[PDB]
Amino acid sequence: MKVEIDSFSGAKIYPGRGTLFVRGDSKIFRFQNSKSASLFKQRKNPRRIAWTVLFRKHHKKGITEEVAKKRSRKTVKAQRPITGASLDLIKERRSLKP
Amino acid sequence: SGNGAQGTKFRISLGLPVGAIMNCADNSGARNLYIIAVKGSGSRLNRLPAASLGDMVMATVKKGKPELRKKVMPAIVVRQAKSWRRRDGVFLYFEDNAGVIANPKGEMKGSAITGPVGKECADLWPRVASNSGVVV
Amino acid sequence: AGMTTIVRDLDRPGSKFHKREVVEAVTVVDTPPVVVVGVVGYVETPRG
Amino acid sequence: ANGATSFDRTKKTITPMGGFVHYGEIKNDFIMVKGCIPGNRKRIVTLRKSLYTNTSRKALEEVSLKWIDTASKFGKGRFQTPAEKHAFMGTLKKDL
Amino acid sequence: MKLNISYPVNGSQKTFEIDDEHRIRVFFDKRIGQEVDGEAVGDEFKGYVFKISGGNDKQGFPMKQGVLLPTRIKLLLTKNVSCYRPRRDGERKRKSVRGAIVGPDLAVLALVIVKKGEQELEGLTDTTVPKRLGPKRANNIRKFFGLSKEDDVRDFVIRREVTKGEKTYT
RNA sequence: GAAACUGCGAAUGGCUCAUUAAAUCAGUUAUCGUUUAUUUGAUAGUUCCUUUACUACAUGGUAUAACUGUGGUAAUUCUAGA
RNA sequence: UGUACAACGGGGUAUUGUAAGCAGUAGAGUAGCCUUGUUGUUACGAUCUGCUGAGAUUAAGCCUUUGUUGUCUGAUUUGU
RNA sequence: GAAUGUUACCGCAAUAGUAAUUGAACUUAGUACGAGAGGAACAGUUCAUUCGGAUAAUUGGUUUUUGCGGCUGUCUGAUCAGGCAUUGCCGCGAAGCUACCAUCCGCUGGAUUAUGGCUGAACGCCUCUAAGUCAGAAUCCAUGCUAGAACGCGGUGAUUUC
RNA sequence: GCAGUCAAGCGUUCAUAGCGACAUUGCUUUUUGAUUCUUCGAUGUCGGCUCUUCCUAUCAUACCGAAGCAGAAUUCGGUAA
RNA sequence: GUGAACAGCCUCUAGUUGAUAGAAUAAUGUAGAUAAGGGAAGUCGGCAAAAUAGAUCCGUAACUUCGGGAUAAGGAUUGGC
Ligand SMILES: CN1C(=O)N[C@H]2[C@@H]3NC(=O)c4ccc(Br)n4[C@@H]3C[C@]21O
Ligand SMILES: [Mg+2]
Ligand SMILES: [Mg+2]
Ligand SMILES: [Mg+2]
Ligand SMILES: [Mg+2]
Ligand SMILES: [Mg+2]
Ligand SMILES: [Mg+2]
Ligand SMILES: [Mg+2]
Ligand SMILES: [Mg+2]
Ligand SMILES: [Mg+2]
Ligand SMILES: [Mg+2]
Ligand SMILES: [Mg+2]
Ligand SMILES: [Mg+2]
Ligand SMILES: [Mg+2]
Ligand SMILES: [Mg+2]
Ligand SMILES: [Mg+2]
Ligand SMILES: [Mg+2]
Ligand SMILES: [Mg+2]
Ligand SMILES: [Mg+2]
Ligand SMILES: [Mg+2]
Ligand SMILES: [Mg+2]
Ligand SMILES: [Mg+2]
Ligand SMILES: [Mg+2]
Ligand SMILES: [Mg+2]
Ligand SMILES: [Mg+2]
Ligand SMILES: [Mg+2]
Ligand SMILES: [Mg+2]
Ligand SMILES: [Mg+2]
Ligand SMILES: [Mg+2]
Ligand SMILES: [Mg+2]
Ligand SMILES: [Mg+2]
Ligand SMILES: [Mg+2]
Ligand SMILES: [Mg+2]
Ligand SMILES: [Mg+2]
Ligand SMILES: [Mg+2]
Ligand SMILES: [Mg+2]
Ligand SMILES: [Mg+2]
Ligand SMILES: [Mg+2]
Ligand SMILES: [Mg+2]
Ligand SMILES: [Mg+2]
Ligand SMILES: [Mg+2]
Ligand SMILES: [Mg+2]
Ligand SMILES: [Mg+2]
Ligand SMILES: [Mg+2]
Ligand SMILES: [Mg+2]
Ligand SMILES: [Mg+2]
Ligand SMILES: [Mg+2]
Ligand SMILES: [Mg+2]
Ligand SMILES: [Mg+2]
Ligand SMILES: [Mg+2]
Ligand SMILES: [Mg+2]
Ligand SMILES: [Mg+2]
Ligand SMILES: [Mg+2]
Ligand SMILES: [Mg+2]
Ligand SMILES: [Mg+2]
Ligand SMILES: [Mg+2]
Ligand SMILES: [Mg+2]
Ligand SMILES: [Mg+2]
Ligand SMILES: [Mg+2]
Ligand SMILES: [Mg+2]
Ligand SMILES: [Mg+2]
Ligand SMILES: [Mg+2]
Ligand SMILES: [Mg+2]
Ligand SMILES: [Mg+2]
Ligand SMILES: [Mg+2]
Ligand SMILES: [Mg+2]
């Protein structure tokens, strides 16, 4: 069960909802409803239509806490010497000097 | 439908009543197909026989290689315009009305099919599957 | 109460839509427990 | 989680957003019947046992629901749960 | 779907096939670079945090970081970019790519351990495979062993024993 | 000395005669109107900093193929994660 | 005289698609004064932007309600 | 809708009406049959036509939600907010109504016909018939479904004091 | 217009699988006539559209019987509106 | 005022606010409208209805009595500041 999203508005299209358009270049366009569907056919440009996802994105609207800092990282610090080099002679070889 | 069309066909909304003219999507030289009938249709007083994507119709050629013209030949609707609905619940529609000229068996005439094609047409007609790049 | 839509996988071996999802209309009817306040008997008669 | 299923899992009753139009919320046990029934909403309706045992293969099919639409029927419904609506739009002028 | 998982510490890598879509479903609608909490993957993976590094969907097409989408689209490629190896000078090829947003269409998900859980995994934290090669250049030897260039690199180069018949070499 | 990186070549060759009628092409000019790998010959004491507590010159930096190993695809001189 | 009913107000749902006001180094530009400029200043300019997915409408045959106010005995007629 | 005491609830069912249709593909089967060329059907499955009864989750249509936004002209000094143009115009538009333009549903017993039979005389034989009898059709009667006789009916509740 | 009886013939042979001459018996009243009873102080006087019902001399769909029916196809007939 | 305009639409002056009324909003209508896909298959017949339309620029066929045909046809363009 794929919930699709509108190729105009951007809202999720749940099963059965909305309409599907196969353009002549065989590019597919899905609409959640008649509103986007018409507005698409009207040659409106979504980045000019205030309520579309494209619009709010392009205009940077409401992304605040998704722009904040995050902690994702790791720690290893291990020793697994060169292969066939007898790693039993590769440990006592490095404490270094300095 | 009904002759050389392997498998069956779930009912699809009828976009093409007789007299409709649809684009010809193959390389046969035929520009358009004027629908004079629909194979395997019904009868009701004053009802226009209609065709849907995947149906076989008898048609003619209004614009085309003059060797295709003034003659009746079978054809298969590859693309609708009218919004139809599959069992998976989607309401979908193509941009144009289109079909290709075909022999009664359901074998093509030309070797290529320009533009996308419905799966309902594809699943149904083997030869169409061959020449069709973009399904649905 | 009204209606809604349902999606389920179809089991109908032989159907083109076998094993594939189908959206389906349904109805809902609110049916809180009925309560039994009596019982009447009936006899057969040549009239009914 | 009436409207929840094995596959859906989100806890929700069958009642659409803002409720059933013209009816209410369905706060009790219910029957869900495939397709459309005679009579209009709010009407007293009898559900009767079948008068014959049917084989038919079209019946007898045991079905399990995947997902039931809980979206609003009073408009072009988009969201299912009130959570999913706040999820997707985010914070609004009233809100917190 | 299958999981191709990798421990970047040990160098160990093992695959795990996961049925039961609910367990799989944790990864859905998720990007490359996001981390996963492995309690929901199963109880063997409890406490492990993963990384989605890529993978191949059905038909095997690779993913690409940055493309977003849960789909498969066609892109023009150039040198020094993923999923393209140019066969000629300044050769570009438009090829198909699969999106970076995880979906049920994926046959295999590429995963990279971040942190360790409470249970040792059979082929991963259990076994460790040593690095293939040691330092070659001048200071890299110095800086692998922290030698403070005095210490005469030639002593500190790594040697690999190999046996030729009854004659073993270095 | 496989593979691979790197450098160079792949713009020569060979084939064909479709277009082309002041175009090509021919002879004859022009660059005081330009680009030119290569070959050949010439051509480089200067690189730092308010210029004693000083800059790696006994030479500074990683990031990658090949390789190892885990993978996908019916399928290609497809390729991914480690 | 009560999970009573009603009229409003609140909340959900839904429609449009960003209100009035104020502000800005947004704005093709344009004037007026002199201390004739080392952003010179006061303003004016279709439009743009921010406050603002805001403002408006939403039962009239939508959902809901611990808030508010009010209503809760008039008329006729019936017997084996 | 008067009157068969009043009033209410639950039922019965006379009589009347009645409804479903047709096709194709898979499979059977390249089988039966045939020298070949050709080439079926019964059971099982998937769909389809014409018909009917619903229904509005979804999709489409409708727009005085004159709901929101836009636009022309003019009028209110300007702004705000509005008025007028037979609903001024336009885009979107919920609700309702609605569409093989949308979705759902359309029941199973009996008795027969033609016909093919059993037993079996007339007529020592023979015969489906004379007596008696079996099987049988898109037919028929029911089942089911729709009304409910306003002069067909049953069960049950409450039955008035100025 | 439709259906009979007799059976010389057609049908390779064989009257009646399917047909059928010469004759002859009938039915029907969507043919045309014949007549002129009814309406001339008026029964709107082609065709189509539309909707209902009825008829069967059944084109199809159900079940049968027959064949010059191997199969396939088809033809003749019964119950059938 | 808009505009080419004594057109249409809005206003000043002046004059009206006269046309039984109330409540509803079934069928059928009369008058105004909209319809997915198809596009005259409807019908005696495109009846009706729809489409077109101003202006600037570009472009413009047969044929002709040379005057025409001709806004032929076919195109682009239009606000605000
Ligand atoms: C309609 N009618 C009319 O007006 N007068 C009547 C006439 N009666 C007749 O005898 C007759 C013969 C020919 C004709 Br036409 N009719 C007419 C039929 C009629 O009923
Ligand atoms: Mg619309
Ligand atoms: Mg709509
Ligand atoms: Mg007709
Ligand atoms: Mg012509
Ligand atoms: Mg081919
Ligand atoms: Mg509702
Ligand atoms: Mg709704
Ligand atoms: Mg050459
Ligand atoms: Mg680097
Ligand atoms: Mg009150
Ligand atoms: Mg805004
Ligand atoms: Mg009403
Ligand atoms: Mg309050
Ligand atoms: Mg009395
Ligand atoms: Mg076969
Ligand atoms: Mg033979
Ligand atoms: Mg019928
Ligand atoms: Mg119907
Ligand atoms: Mg308005
Ligand atoms: Mg204005
Ligand atoms: Mg202002
Ligand atoms: Mg006025
Ligand atoms: Mg007027
Ligand atoms: Mg609607
Ligand atoms: Mg029954
Ligand atoms: Mg016998
Ligand atoms: Mg008998
Ligand atoms: Mg008898
Ligand atoms: Mg007898
Ligand atoms: Mg029947
Ligand atoms: Mg009976
Ligand atoms: Mg029934
Ligand atoms: Mg009664
Ligand atoms: Mg009674
Ligand atoms: Mg004779
Ligand atoms: Mg014979
Ligand atoms: Mg003879
Ligand atoms: Mg006749
Ligand atoms: Mg005559
Ligand atoms: Mg007469
Ligand atoms: Mg008279
Ligand atoms: Mg007369
Ligand atoms: Mg008269
Ligand atoms: Mg009369
Ligand atoms: Mg008359
Ligand atoms: Mg009619
Ligand atoms: Mg014979
Ligand atoms: Mg018979
Ligand atoms: Mg009848
Ligand atoms: Mg009868
Ligand atoms: Mg009057
Ligand atoms: Mg009036
Ligand atoms: Mg009135
Ligand atoms: Mg009307
Ligand atoms: Mg409209
Ligand atoms: Mg239309
Ligand atoms: Mg057209
Ligand atoms: Mg035409
Ligand atoms: Mg016609
Ligand atoms: Mg005509
Ligand atoms: Mg015309
Ligand atoms: Mg006209
Ligand atoms: Mg129009
Ligand atoms: Mg002309
Ligand atoms: Mg301009």
Side-chain angles (χ1 to χ4, degrees), chain A residues 1-64 68 78 81 84-85 98, chain B, chain C residues 1-38 41-48, chain D, chain E:
Chain A
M1 171 189 146
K2 203 161 185 171
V3 182
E4 236 78 21
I5 98 160
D6 193 311
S7 47
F8 187 89
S9 82
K12 300 179 172 185
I13 308 167
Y14 264 83
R17 191 67 50 152
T19 148
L20 182 138
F21 168 64
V22 169
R23 186 158 63 182
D25 69 339
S26 331
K27 174 134 174 52
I28 309 181
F29 295 83
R30 299 167 183 275
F31 313 97
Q32 208 281 345
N33 71 341
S34 51
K35 181 183 195 192
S36 49
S38 158
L39 216 54
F40 163 83
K41 285 178 306 185
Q42 284 191 18
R43 310 289 238 80
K44 296 301 184 203
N45 167 33
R47 331 187 156 279
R48 306 190 74 177
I49 299 300
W51 56 266
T52 75
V53 169
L54 291 82
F55 186 89
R56 307 186 88 256
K57 209 155 288 197
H58 173 267
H59 279 53
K60 295 196 193 304
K61 284 295 187 172
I63 207 175
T64 47
Chain B
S1 312
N3 190 346
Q6 196 150 353
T8 78
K9 215 204 57 181
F10 189 79
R11 199 205 147 94
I12 158 171
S13 261
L14 305 154
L16 299 180
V18 160
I21 311 181
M22 69 209 190
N23 301 323
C24 174
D26 61 35
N27 49 317
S28 66
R31 172 74 88 269
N32 66 7
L33 300 161
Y34 168 72
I35 314 187
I36 66 166
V38 182
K39 302 282 289 175
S41 72
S43 330
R44 169 54 148 98
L45 185 45
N46 309 115
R47 244 216 267 314
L48 271 190
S52 67
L53 142 78
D55 286 351
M56 177 151 62
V57 324
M58 301 317 194
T60 61
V61 180
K62 258 43 198 159
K63 311 174 167 272
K65 261 182 176 78
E67 308 74 26
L68 278 14
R69 303 193 44 245
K70 284 183 118 296
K71 53 169 39 270
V72 39
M73 72 227 196
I76 317 176
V77 187
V78 312
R79 297 198 299 269
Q80 273 195 354
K82 173 64 210 324
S83 193
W84 83 100
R85 170 196 173 281
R86 308 159 167 195
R87 281 134 131 180
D88 68 343
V90 51
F91 279 84
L92 73 166
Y93 61 91
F94 283 94
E95 193 160 58
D96 71 320
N97 296 287
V100 301
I101 129 89
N103 106 287
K105 265 194 206 302
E107 297 171 14
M108 298 270 311
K109 177 128 173 183
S111 59
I113 303 168
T114 170
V117 178
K119 126 229 187 216
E120 290 91 8
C121 190
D123 274 31
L124 188 43
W125 303 96
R127 315 298 288 240
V128 172
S130 301
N131 321 134
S132 37
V134 200
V135 178
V136 177
Chain C
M3 302 187 179
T4 192
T5 340
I6 260 73
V7 179
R8 71 175 170 88
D9 284 309
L10 164 80
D11 163 79
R12 192 179 303 159
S15 188
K16 173 178 173 189
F17 253 65
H18 185 51
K19 291 287 228 311
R20 201 197 308 173
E21 305 173 309
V22 274
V23 324
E24 258 172 342
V26 300
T27 62
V28 176
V29 37
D30 190 346
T31 53
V34 91
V35 11
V36 210
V37 274
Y42 289 84
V43 1
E44 299 168 333
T45 94
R47 298 188 261 160
Chain D
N2 280 334
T5 348
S6 170
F7 169 78
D8 187 286
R9 288 255 185 167
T10 68
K11 283 157 36 62
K12 71 186 178 186
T13 39
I14 1 87
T15 333
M17 292 251 306
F20 275 91
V21 180
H22 286 165
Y23 186 64
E25 283 190 344
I26 317 206
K27 299 193 267 193
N28 269 89
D29 325 8
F30 65 84
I31 290 303
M32 174 158 92
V33 143
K34 146 76 181 310
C36 81
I37 245 159
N40 59 271
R41 76 279 184 290
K42 297 151 101 184
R43 183 152 292 149
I44 174 65
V45 182
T46 299
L47 290 334
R48 172 192 66 179
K49 291 268 186 196
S50 201
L51 305 162
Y52 73 108
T53 70
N54 183 32
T55 318
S56 84
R57 182 150 167 170
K58 227 175 174 183
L60 316 185
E61 178 200 335
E62 298 185 72
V63 316
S64 313
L65 313 162
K66 216 161 179 163
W67 161 90
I68 302 172
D69 182 280
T70 205
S72 181
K73 275 72 189 64
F74 191 53
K76 297 289 175 59
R78 304 161 66 185
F79 313 98
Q80 307 297 317
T81 35
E84 189 184 314
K85 178 210 197 94
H86 179 280
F88 177 83
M89 271 195 306
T91 186
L92 287 181
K93 198 197 175 176
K94 18 158 192 183
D95 258 326
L96 300 89
Chain E
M1 73 176 52
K2 190 177 304 172
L3 300 188
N4 188 329
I5 327 188
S6 27
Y7 207 7
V9 177
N10 302 27
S12 312
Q13 24 188 355
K14 184 179 186 65
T15 47
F16 294 97
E17 302 179 274
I18 300 284
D19 306 83
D20 316 314
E21 321 169 332
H22 283 92
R23 302 189 202 268
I24 311 174
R25 209 143 138 260
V26 195
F27 293 87
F28 287 155
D29 289 88
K30 303 319 295 161
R31 300 166 191 83
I32 292 181
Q34 300 203 227
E35 283 170 346
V36 200
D37 294 314
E39 182 76 280
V41 184
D43 302 336
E44 324 88 57
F45 304 97
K46 176 184 171 187
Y48 291 88
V49 162
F50 296 82
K51 187 80 168 306
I52 292 178
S53 66
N56 308 82
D57 66 341
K58 323 292 184 57
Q59 292 69 59
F61 290 96
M63 307 188 208
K64 209 181 178 70
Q65 194 171 222
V67 299
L68 291 312
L69 277 61
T71 119
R72 199 224 310 296
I73 74 175
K74 278 171 159 291
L75 286 176
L76 191 267
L77 301 155
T78 55
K79 63 158 173 48
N80 263 313
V81 76
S82 50
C83 326
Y84 186 69
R85 195 188 62 73
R87 311 309 174 103
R88 209 183 174 115
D89 266 325
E91 189 201 45
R92 300 169 312 186
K93 275 177 183 185
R94 185 190 321 295
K95 294 179 59 58
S96 295
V97 190
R98 203 273 161 193
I101 306 179
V102 182
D105 61 313
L106 305 175
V108 176
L109 209 174
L111 294 161
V112 177
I113 308 293
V114 183
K115 276 85 67 172
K116 176 181 179 180
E118 57 182 63
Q119 188 70 1
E120 218 84 1
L121 298 180
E122 183 82 303
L124 222 49
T125 346
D126 128 287
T127 176
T128 141
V129 43
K131 286 169 57 170
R132 205 71 221 294
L133 238 52
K136 184 180 167 64
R137 200 231 303 273
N139 287 272
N140 278 8
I141 303 190
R142 296 181 177 101
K143 271 52 175 180
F144 185 24
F145 301 151
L147 293 180
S148 77
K149 37 156 188 183
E150 262 95 24
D151 277 89
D152 194 347
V153 159
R154 293 104 68 98
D155 317 32
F156 284 88
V157 64
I158 191 66
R159 323 198 60 90
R160 172 163 71 95
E161 298 181 356
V162 54
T163 81
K164 161 200 179 77
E166 301 321 301
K167 182 186 205 174
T168 75
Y169 258 111
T170 153

